[PDB]
Design a protein around this ligand. Structure first.
Ligand SMILES: CC(C)(COP(=O)(O)OP(=O)(O)OC[C@H]1O[C@@H](n2cnc3c(N)ncnc32)[C@H](O)[C@@H]1OP(=O)(O)O)[C@@H](O)C(=O)NCCC(=O)NCCS
Lengths: 6, 161
């Protein structure tokens, strides 16, 4: 769940 | 448009779908080491529910890991391919996932989230405050200070789907 500012 | 559970059973058919899913994850999760996605997607403990269009095409999916005795599961990766986003698939997938998790006698869903994702998971019912005893996941789910641990309670008879 990386989702950095995606 | 089917939402099927997919697991590494070593067949050409399932293996190809898992790879397609893995490739969607990496392209949609650039901050994640590709080899890391590979490791979890194909390991003995993880499972993937995929969004399949007319029997032979992965357009999205969610890779998760259940801790059966504990009755909770961690969401490892979630994604919908670029050309299929904003069509409601990601939300139907989550609903399908929760319904399946409910049938699997799983009580809580846990997932780490960061930046935009936190808001996305709040929309899917996940919260920052956990009603689940901390000592239940401790030792099973890695504790990262740099991430926000979120949880979704799966009530035995609330209709998710
Ligand atoms: C998160 C994800 C699975 C959502 O799947 P989806 O098929 O696009 O989902 P939905 O369309 O049902 O999502 C609904 C919401 O996402 C927003 N959204 C998703 N992709 C979008 C895009 N490319 N542009 C604008 N909005 C987008 C919708 O606008 C909508 O907003 P709302 O909830 O206020 O109505 C998808 O955006 C994705 O694969 N993202 C990259 C990977 C990622 O961050 N995964 C989760 C953390 S690992």
């Amino acid at each position: 769940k990386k989702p950095l500012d995606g | 448009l089917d939402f099927d559970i997919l697991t590494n059973d070593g067949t050409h058919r399932n293996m190809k779908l898992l790879i397609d899913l893995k490739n969607i994850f990496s392209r949609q999760l650039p901050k994640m080491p590709k080899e890391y996605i590979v490791k979890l997607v194909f390991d003995r403990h993880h499972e993937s529910m995929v969004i399949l269009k007319n029997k032979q095409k992965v357009i999205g999916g969610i890779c998760f890991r259940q801790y059966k005795p504990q009755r909770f599961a961690e969401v490892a990766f979630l994604a919908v391919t670029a050309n299929e986003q904003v069509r409601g698939y990601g939300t139907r997938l989550m609903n399908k996932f929760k319904d399946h998790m409910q049938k699997q006698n799983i009580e809580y869903l846990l997932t780490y989230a960061d930046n935009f994702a936190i808001g996305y998971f709040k929309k899917q019912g996940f919260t920052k405050e956990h009603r689940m005893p901390q000592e239940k996941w401790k030792g099973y789910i890695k504790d990262y200070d740099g991430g926000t641990l979120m949880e979704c309670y799966i009530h035995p008879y609330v209709d998710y789907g």
